[PDB]
Amino acid sequence: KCRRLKQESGLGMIVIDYLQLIQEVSEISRSLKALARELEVPVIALSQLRPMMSDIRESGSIEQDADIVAFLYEIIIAKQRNGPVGTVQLAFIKEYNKFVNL
Amino acid sequence: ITGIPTGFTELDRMTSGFQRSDLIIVAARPSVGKTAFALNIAQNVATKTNENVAIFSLEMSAQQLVMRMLCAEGNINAQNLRTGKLTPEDWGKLTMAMGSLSNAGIYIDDTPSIRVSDIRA
């Protein structure tokens, strides 16, 4: 579906709602990485589990396929290959359901 | 209504103020909000009327008091004033909350714990 949309209209982001719920997961992780590579587009795969690395790792690879692993807690960028690793802090509204700057 | 208005519709009715010469004692168990209640009256009497209010804040500091009534205005804070940084919504808010409370008739005295004679002086 993403492939057909790229040629006909454009495409810039693939935001998949949660991985654990797509249909072993290591074999899916693999495919999502390739998808991003084929379409020259960032793919955002949401995942379900403090937090830290071994919370998701114990359930299907992912770690070595994803090149940036964010955590919502605080936004913890625990792994990225661009460069830096640390904590970015975001405000959250609720009523409006927005995440906002600071 | 007499008086000096409380700000609060149906408190006004039973009392008609707050009027002049009466000693009003507001009592409540720790952390029920007796300060935050007296502050809001003080505020409404300062920002809405044109009548100087004197606040003696024996417990809490003079400036830890002001945010407690800066928050009570511009409807500011979860973001929070305390924990450093704010949103363009908080900033653009404080500025008005600071501006409206700027022209109020509030006088604070935090002097640690003072004898009555001094309050009176």
From Swiss-Prot, chain A:
Residues of the full protein shown: 304 to 441 of 454
Domain remark from Swiss-Prot or TrEMBL: Within the hexamer the N-terminal domains (NTD) form a rigid ring, while the C-terminal domains (CTD) form a looser ring; the 2 rings stack to form a double-layered ring. In a complex without DNA or bound nucleotides the central channel varies from 25-50 Angstroms in diameter. The NTD interacts with the helicase-binding domain of DnaG primase. In complex with ssDNA and an NTP analog forms a double-layered, right-handed spiral staircase with a small internal diameter; 5 of the 6 subunits bind NTP. Closely contacts 11 nucleotides of ssDNA, the 5'-end points toward the NTD staircase.
UniProt superkingdom: Bacteria
Record: residues binding ATP: 48, 79-81
Effect of residue 48 to A: Partial loss of helicase and ATPase activities, ATPase and helicase partially activated by DnaG primase, wild-type ss- and dsDNA binding
Quaternary state and interactors: Homohexamer. Interacts with DnaG primase, as DnaB(6):DnaG(3). Interacts with the N-terminus of DnaI (shown with DnaI of B.subtilis), forms a helicase DnaB(6):DnaI(6) complex. The DnaB-DnaI complex is disrupted by DnaD (DnaD and DnaI from B.subtilis). A stable complex DnaI(6):DnaB(6):DnaG(3) fragment can be isolated; DnaI and DnaG do not contact each other (DnaI in this complex is derived from B.subtilis). Forms a complex with DNA clamp loader protein tau (shown with B.subtilis HolA) tau(3):DnaB(6); a single ATP hydrolysis even is sufficient for complex formation.
Residues of the site described as Gamma-phosphate sensor: 48
UniProt-recorded name of the protein: Replicative DNA helicase DnaB
Resulting phenotype, residue 17 to A/N: Loss of helicase and ATPase activity, still interacts with DnaG, 4- to 15-fold decreased ssDNA-binding
Residues that bind ssDNA: 57-58, 60
Assigned protein family: Belongs to the helicase family. DnaB subfamily.
Functional summary from the UniProt entry: The main replicative DNA helicase, it participates in initiation and elongation during chromosome replication. Travels ahead of the DNA replisome, separating double-stranded (ds)DNA into templates for DNA synthesis. Binding of single-stranded (ss)DNA to the hexamer suggests a 2-nucleotide step size for the helicase and a hand-over-hand mechanism of DNA unwinding. Has ssDNA-stimulated ATPase activity. DnaG primase stimulates the helicase activity (the helicase direction was not determine but is probably 5'-3').
